[PDB]
Point group: C2
Chain length 187, copies 2
């Protein structure tokens, strides 16, 4: 998109001190990582999924059972969910240019909730942050238990720790922006 | 073999009344069944053993685990073991008859007692041992369509499929039933001898 400078710049103008630091983390360390490096790592997620079996359809059900949602698809959804509250406030500030307190605090509160929900979903669904080389599968029509092997498990572990750590930082930065605002009014 | 009539005829002459029946059941209903029909039922046992796996060597070890000794090879050994005590005694009867002529119903008079009563006793034990091995090693007389295998190098448990299990079950039941008949026939010959000497 050739208008990225305009929309990012528009958010940049209508932002506080920390809010400008938060924007550089979301765009440079999260959007670019998901676009230039991570999206190609997951290219052959199912094509290079190898199962030690002769059963037709066993590979399809086993990959589906262990990867109900791809990692890169989860991060694409999370990025969009933590992007609407910031832009909606930014558009409202532009329209205003009082009531801004109840929107700016709400957007920060919503972003923290969204970021913690996705991180929780990542942990519970994928039983940790480490991808295993071998998955044992016993769903129909696979006979007994079938051994299957994941494509690039180590590459995916490095990029998932990187994304989780950055999201953890975004939680901390949004907490301080609440602490800065909380002491102004109710303290 | 072209001398089959010679050996069977010779054994037939040197036998008791029941012993001639036992000659018929052994050759017609055990040797002929094994040769004419049973042997090529098992001809493809490993070739069409099929395992649902991609692991090299898993078919080899799974077939070996479940069929350490083939049925037809077990029957071939049993037939040889239960044939020697009969042939050895029949040869000894010829030597005893040879001595008298050099000086047609077989009668047990002297030292022939401890040979005949032992050949009958050995044949009962040999048949019971093979019937026991058949039951214990193959957990019964029915062959299953599916065997589940987990010996190395098979990953977890692997499904494998036997060639002609029903055909093999039918011939297994036939061979065990005839073998049990031969045991019953042999026990009666002991009873005939037991009431003569020690009764």
């Amino acid at each position: 998109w050739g208008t990225l400078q305009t929309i990012l710049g528009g958010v940049n103008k209508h932002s506080t001190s920390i809010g400008k630091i938060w924007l550089t983390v979301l765009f440079i360390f999260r959007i670019m990582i998901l676009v230039v490096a991570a999206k190609e790592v997951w290219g052959d997620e199912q094509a290079d999924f190898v199962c030690n079996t002769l059963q037709p359809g066993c590979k399809n059900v086993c990959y589906d059972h262990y990867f109900p949602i791809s990692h890169i698809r989860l991060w694409a959804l999370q990025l969009i969910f933590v992007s609407t509250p910031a832009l909606l406030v930014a558009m409202h500030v532009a329209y205003r240019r009082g009531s801004l307190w109840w929107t700016y605090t709400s957007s920060i509160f919503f972003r923290v909730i969204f970021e913690a929900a996705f991180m929780y979903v990542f942990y519970v669904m994928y039983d940790g942050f480490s991808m295993q080389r071998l998955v044992k599968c016993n769903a129909w029509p696979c006979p007994n238990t079938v051994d299957c092997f994941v494509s690039r498990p180590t590459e995916k572990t490095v990029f998932t720790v990187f994304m989780i750590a950055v999201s953890g930082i975004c939680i901390l930065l949004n907490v301080t922006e609440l602490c800065y605002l909380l002491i102004r009014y109710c303290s």
